[PDB]
């Protein structure tokens, strides 16, 4: 049988799928993620903040 990928398939998004939140996923915390500090962030902390005495 043709073992190649099939061109001639609908390339468009499919508007026929459950649009609701899925209540069937692991609800527990995930113990599988980089636990390190992550040196990839903006070190210049000034783009937006509340300057009032009682902010």
């Amino acid at each position, epitope marked *: *049988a*043709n*073992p*190649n*990928a099939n061109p001639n398939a609908n390339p468009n998004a499919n508007p026929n799928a459950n649009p609701n939140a899925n209540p069937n996923a692991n609800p527990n915390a995930n113990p599988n993620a980089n636990p390190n500090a992550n040196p990839n962030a903006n070190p210049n902390a000034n783009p937006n903040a509340n300057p009032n005495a009682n902010p």
Partner: nanobody
Amino acid sequence: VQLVESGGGVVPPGRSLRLSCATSGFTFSNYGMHWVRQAPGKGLEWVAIIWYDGSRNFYAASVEGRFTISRDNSKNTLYLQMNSLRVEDTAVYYCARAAYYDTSGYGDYWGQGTLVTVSS
């Protein structure tokens, strides 16, 4: 289309050896692949096929359970793991790109091959 065999050499029988093919010039992930081999002085023997998404594999009866075919689409690489090599497995191995016509398929862009020798 560039298909390059690598990883041949000589081993005592009973040993394992992994072959692989590097490729470019086309989208690897859209095509299935084949391995064939030619023992010196002999004609061609089909060895194995792997589907474009890795979902199916078929082997020549003469090698099933001894040979494993696999691929990694993210590296544009095709692999063949040969276990328990027998003397009878001495051959030049080649990689080929799957093609299909109508009622049967064919290959159309092969590599140069690499030689695997099994001997004591």
